[PDB]
Amino acid sequence: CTLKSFTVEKGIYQTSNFRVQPTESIVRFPNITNLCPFGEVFNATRFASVYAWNRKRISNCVADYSVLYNSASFSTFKCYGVSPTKLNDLCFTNVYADSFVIRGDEVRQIAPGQTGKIADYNYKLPDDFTGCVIAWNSNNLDSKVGGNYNYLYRLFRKSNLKPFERDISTEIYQAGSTPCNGVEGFNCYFPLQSYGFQPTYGVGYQPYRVVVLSFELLHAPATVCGPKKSTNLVKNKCVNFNFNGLTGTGVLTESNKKFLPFQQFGRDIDDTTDAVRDPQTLEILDITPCSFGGVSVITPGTNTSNQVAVLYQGVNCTEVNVFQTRAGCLIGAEHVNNSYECDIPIGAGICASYQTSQSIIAYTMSLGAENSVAYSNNSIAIPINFTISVTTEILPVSMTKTSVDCTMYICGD
Amino acid sequence: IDRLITGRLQSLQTYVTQQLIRAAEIRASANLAATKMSECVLGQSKRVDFCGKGYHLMSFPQSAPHGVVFLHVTYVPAQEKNFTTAPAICHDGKAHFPR
Amino acid sequence: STECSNLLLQYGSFCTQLNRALTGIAVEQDKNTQEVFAQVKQIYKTPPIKDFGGFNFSQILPDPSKSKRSFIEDLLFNKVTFNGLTVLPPLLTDEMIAQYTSALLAGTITSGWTFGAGAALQIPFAMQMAYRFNGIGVTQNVLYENQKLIANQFNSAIGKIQDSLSSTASALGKLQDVVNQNAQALNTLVKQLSSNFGAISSVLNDILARLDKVEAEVQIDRLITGRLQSLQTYVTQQLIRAAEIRASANLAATKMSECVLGQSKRVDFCGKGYHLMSFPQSAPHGVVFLHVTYVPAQEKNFTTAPAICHDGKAHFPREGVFVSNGTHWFVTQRNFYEPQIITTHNTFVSGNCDVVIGIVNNTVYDP
Amino acid sequence: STECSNLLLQYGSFCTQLNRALTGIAVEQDKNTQEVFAQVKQIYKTPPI
Amino acid sequence: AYTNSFTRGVYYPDKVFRSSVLHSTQDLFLPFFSNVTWFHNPVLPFNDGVYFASTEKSNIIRGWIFGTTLDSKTQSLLIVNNATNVVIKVCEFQFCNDPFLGVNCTFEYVSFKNLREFVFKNIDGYFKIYSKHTPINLVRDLPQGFSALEPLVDLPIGINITRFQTLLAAYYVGYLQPRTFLLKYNENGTITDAVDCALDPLSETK
Ligand SMILES: *[C@@H]1O[C@H](CO)[C@@H](O[C@@H]2O[C@H](CO)[C@@H](O)[C@H](O)[C@H]2NC(C)=O)[C@H](O)[C@H]1NC(C)=O
Ligand SMILES: *[C@@H]1O[C@H](CO)[C@@H](O[C@@H]2O[C@H](CO)[C@@H](O)[C@H](O)[C@H]2NC(C)=O)[C@H](O)[C@H]1NC(C)=O
Ligand SMILES: *[C@@H]1O[C@H](CO)[C@@H](O[C@@H]2O[C@H](CO)[C@@H](O)[C@H](O)[C@H]2NC(C)=O)[C@H](O)[C@H]1NC(C)=O
Ligand SMILES: *[C@@H]1O[C@H](CO)[C@@H](O)[C@H](O)[C@H]1NC(C)=O
Ligand SMILES: *[C@@H]1O[C@H](CO)[C@@H](O)[C@H](O)[C@H]1NC(C)=O
Ligand SMILES: *[C@@H]1O[C@H](CO)[C@@H](O)[C@H](O)[C@H]1NC(C)=O
Ligand SMILES: *[C@@H]1O[C@H](CO)[C@@H](O)[C@H](O)[C@H]1NC(C)=O
Ligand SMILES: *[C@@H]1O[C@H](CO)[C@@H](O)[C@H](O)[C@H]1NC(C)=O
Ligand SMILES: *[C@@H]1O[C@H](CO)[C@@H](O)[C@H](O)[C@H]1NC(C)=O
Ligand SMILES: *[C@@H]1O[C@H](CO)[C@@H](O)[C@H](O)[C@H]1NC(C)=O
Ligand SMILES: *[C@@H]1O[C@H](CO)[C@@H](O)[C@H](O)[C@H]1NC(C)=O
Ligand SMILES: *[C@@H]1O[C@H](CO)[C@@H](O)[C@H](O)[C@H]1NC(C)=O
Ligand SMILES: *[C@@H]1O[C@H](CO)[C@@H](O)[C@H](O)[C@H]1NC(C)=O
């Protein structure tokens, strides 16, 4: 198939390339540290009134969402613009967590482009939000006997809030046809009002704690990321690998190199990365490439036999009758103790031939018969007779004259 | 079409470059065959191994498609025998050397 | 990257014709090496006792304590010094090349020009030099009368080769240049993997992480285009560089035949002076010839004439030229002053005196 | 042009190895000329007669 | 006042080990044999980046301030040794017009006989610090010799910088330029000599 023929003449032909494939994948990153303190967002004893909603900004930190989505604690968990399963792979310039208390019936207002007293007067999300919403019943935390009138929401406003607009202005609202003079009156009202939460109420009037998570990315650096996972480390085998950002594939091994305390990678003269520091245990590993080379088929020609030998050029038989030549691992040829003229050349003094039920044999080539010339101080050899000899010599003198019209080769007609 | 022009033009430049390099290899062989014809066929070369092995007597050209064949005729000494030898001989006190 | 490999298929035969080209260059290097060194039919070897007329080859013959290289070949082997890349071994090892230079040298020393023309016919080295002198038109007695002087001048001249080669690496500049150009070409070929070629990054896994499939494919095709142009440039440059080495191996194979295996009449082909013989030594990726030549070194002026008159006949020299010390006329060989009396054996008659422009009146002795 | 020069650096070594190839051919012409003519050691003169 | 830089102010350009090799790099470097400004504080430009050094034995110089305004309207770096170790903040400070120590917070962090040398540069929103501490035998000027500056910190903060000032006695200021240098790495992977390729025709040849 390589030669596009059903007959093959005597020779050595490269039919393929061999390459040791990676046995497994390694990933290494630093010890998981500076985990963000989500207990300030979700587990604080205090919580905010919804008009004055308390925002946390997270920066220069690693934020796990898997603790948030795996926890059974939440009466609702939702996400917009992002898959909840994908969150832990992402990085952002900032992450925001917005926290407040509302009645259980009104939690549905905390959604993209939605409307109502909580949405339009307290906390608003855009028609294309990127983020998540998390909520739980807080009746034992935020209700009190006699009514916890200390929690507040804006019942009245002049106009709807913009997306993410925060507003703690005390502006008195005029519903009637007569002005307020800066105080309540007939159809004039103070804007902030209470549910009066009690433990006995039905679930729609019981308080819920609510958290909204929002994500931001800029040309300003990605200061927040999800946690980074790592595997065990495997030495002395061909492996796919990733150390920090550096992907590669090679045989990782222990090394004598002494990097300075700030250095993380080592390079060859030809830029090629040739050592790495493991970020968890600070050892220096050499990288050496997984074994590769041409595969050649040695054949006495399909006229004489269907036997072949295979040479894996530069490969060692550990990586792949079987015989280790200095040219590479040779398979199917019998090693022979004699020597002959070179029939099919292999390399580094080795040749192969088909010889005595016959088989392929591989041997060190013979340069000629040895001859100690019978030299002496006072003796000469003179020829008594001759042969006239005729020697054929062939020389090529010309190619077949060819022209190619490039205007027609590139684009005929 | 500009992807096809870009690929077919690079394909043809690759061929023309390797044919220019191969034409120089064939010219170097035609300059050698022209030299073997002047020195071996039209003459008798003293140049060792130029016109075959052994001491060269003459050679003959035969044509072949895209080439030439020389039949180099040479003298090879065949049945050697050992003798004792000397650089000179003394006669009447004077050294004689072979002419 | 299997994603890149599936785009590289759209370029068709290109990766096959680059390997077919470099395989032709690699297979040619063993033909170059074979045509220089493998000119000997049998592996000749030297007699045990070194009675070569007082000439001393000990520094160019094998040393069995060392590979079996000569003392000079061990100077020559000291003074020259995986992104899919591979280096293949030569077919003939450096030990096999040293066996061929040993066979060529032991045949040359023990049998002269004869081993290039049939069987090696042994001849004493003092007589081999006599026929190499007689081949440059210096009469063979000029060797045997000066044999100790000539042997000491040869033994001394080989000593200066050892000193010259011991003193500097800049002796072997042509071989170190061939090594340096192949390293410069490969470091260039690998450093070109660091280039963007207009893509968003030089690293495929960075492209594949930043971009969705249809955009990543366009950035990868810029790296494929630039890396394929980078490899075609290397293969073209190696094909041109190999053609220069083939022209040099054809010349080294011609100096093996015409100039080690023979004696050359060709002026300044086998070093300056009238050539006597030369000796091959192996070197890393090359051959070194020690060309031995007769150089005339002190001269004196003489009055001269094209013919002499005798009994009205004009006499011309058979071999040589007529010269006078000022009072007497002699005939000498041309390349060394040995004057002989003018006789009917040293000279030949042709015609009367009156034709020749500048003939002189003298006497021919008839024995 | 500075705008083009900054784009050409993204093609890496190509431009340096073209200058190096033409510089090697230029230096060879002075070698070719000295292989032919500079074979004589001394500047010989003919006599006035 | 002014002094010669000599060969001072080279730093390791990347976190890569290289050994027994010469490497050619283009980066913001202080040019060899350039002028550096000498002082015994003013607000100073930042340009492409700053080399800073001082000769000390008594801790007269405590830290630095960096920003666009260097005052209140927008965020600004405040970097100070608290006499235990380095402290860093980036707030929109409304601090003094002659700031000293005695002889909003989007990020915050905690870490003559001496010449202390530093390099500050700000690229794609990361603020880089390099340094070296070394002995000396002269007070008036930077000592002629070579020793490369190693990295300290690498801060993702995104803040624009065009001016700086030094918190208070001999110190030196020089401005980085986009230059090509050839760097010599020894067997242990330290930079041990360098060539400023634009300096003179012999350096271009090297
Ligand atoms: C990353 O964490 C590991 C595990 O704690 C640290 O390695 C050592 O682990 C052994 C237990 O197997 C402890 O007894 C040692 O005290 C740990 N430390 C050292 C210095 O040996 C490892 O050092 C950590 N790496 C970083 C960069 O923090
Ligand atoms: C011919 O030239 C040679 C140069 O080698 C001369 O030989 C040297 O002669 C001196 C005495 O003058 C000896 O000490 C040396 O040992 C000789 N050299 C060697 C290699 O042995 C020689 O004398 C000259 N002869 C004439 C007639 O001029
Ligand atoms: C050398 O000697 C011959 C023989 O004596 C000279 O021959 C001349 O022969 C003619 C014959 O008619 C005489 O008339 C002359 O008298 C002879 N010459 C002399 C000088 O006597 C021949 O000329 C002489 N050649 C030279 C170069 O001196
Ligand atoms: C809240 O507190 C409990 C008890 O300390 C802890 O197990 C849980 O992980 C915390 N959850 C969050 C969301 O912080
Ligand atoms: C082949 O590999 C094995 C295992 O590393 C080693 O023992 C052997 O020496 C190698 N031989 C060659 C010629 O590479
Ligand atoms: C070749 O001969 C040697 C003699 O010592 C022996 O060690 C070796 O096994 C032989 N190999 C073969 C293939 O016969
Ligand atoms: C010449 O003589 C030697 C010693 O007797 C012998 O070894 C050698 O074979 C002889 N050669 C020929 C061609 O007869
Ligand atoms: C030849 O010269 C060497 C020194 O180069 C010397 O040791 C040796 O004795 C000389 N003679 C012979 C016959 O080797
Ligand atoms: C030979 O003759 C010329 C001209 O008289 C003279 O210059 C030269 O010195 C003479 N001697 C030798 C040894 O050439
Ligand atoms: C040399 O020149 C002289 C002077 O012109 C002349 O007399 C003589 O015949 C010439 N001799 C030869 C050998 O040409
Ligand atoms: C710059 O260097 C020169 C000496 O080369 C010096 O005279 C001058 O004061 C320095 N400062 C300025 C700003 O020119
Ligand atoms: C500050 O840096 C940002 C980087 O995106 C840039 O948009 C802005 O123009 C810069 N402002 C100044 C005054 O440099
Ligand atoms: C390099 O490190 C070795 C210890 O591995 C140390 O002996 C040597 O002094 C260091 N410095 C140099 C310049 O080699």
Author numbering:
A (entry chain B): 301 to 620, 641 to 676, 689 to 745
B (entry chain B): 993 to 1091
C (entry chain C): 746 to 811, 813 to 827, 855 to 1140
D (entry chain A): 746 to 794
E (entry chain C): 27 to 66, 81 to 143, 165 to 172, 186 to 242, 263 to 300
What do the study authors state?
Changes in the spike (S) glycoprotein in these variants are under scrutiny because the S protein has a central role in engaging the angiotensin-converting enzyme 2 (ACE2) receptor to mediate cellular entry and is a dominant target of neutralizing antibodies (nAbs) elicited by either vaccination or natural infection. The prefusion SARS-CoV-2 S trimer is composed of S1 and S2 subunits separated by a furin cleavage site. The S1 subunit contains the N-terminal domain (NTD), ACE2 receptor binding domain (RBD), and two subdomains (SD1 and SD2). The RBD transitions between a “closed” (“down”) receptor-inaccessible conformation and an “open” (“up”) conformation that allows binding to the ACE2 receptor.
The B.1.1.7 variant emerged in the UK in September 2020 and spread worldwide, with reports of increased transmissibility, virulence, and mortality. B.1.1.7 spike affinity for ACE2 was improved over the D614G spike by a factor of ~5 as a result of the N501Y substitution. Multiple populations of the 3-RBD-down and RBD-up states were identified, with a higher proportion of RBD-up particles observed for the B.1.1.7 spike (~1.8:1 RBD-up/RBD-down) relative to the D614G spike (~0.8:1) and the mink-associated ΔFV spike (~1.3:1). We identified several RBD-up structures, including a typical 1-RBD-up state and two 1-RBD-up populations with the up RBD and its adjacent NTD disordered. We next sought to understand how variations that are distal from the RBD/NTD region influence the B.1.1.7 spike conformational distribution. These variations spanned multiple domains including SD1 [Ala570 → Asp (A570D)], SD2 [Pro681 → His (P681H)], HR1 [Ser982 → Ala (S982A)], CD [Asp1118 → His (D1118H)], and the linker between SD2 and fusion peptide [Thr716 → Ile (T716I)]. By contrast, the T716I substitution abrogated an intraprotomer hydrogen bond (H-bond) between the Thr716 side-chain and Gln1071 main-chain carbonyls, suggesting a local destabilizing effect. The A570D substitution resulted in an interprotomer H-bond with the Asn856 side chain, reinforcing the stacking of the SD1 loop against the HR1 helix of the adjacent protomer. The HR1 S982A substitution, on the other hand, resulted in the loss of an interprotomer H-bond between the Ser982 and Thr547 side chains. Thus, the S982A mutation appears to disable a latch that modulates the RBD up/down equilibrium, thereby increasing RBD up propensity. In B.1.1.7, amino acid substitutions that destabilize the 3-RBD-down or closed state to favor RBD-up or open states are balanced by substitutions that stabilize the prefusion spike conformation.
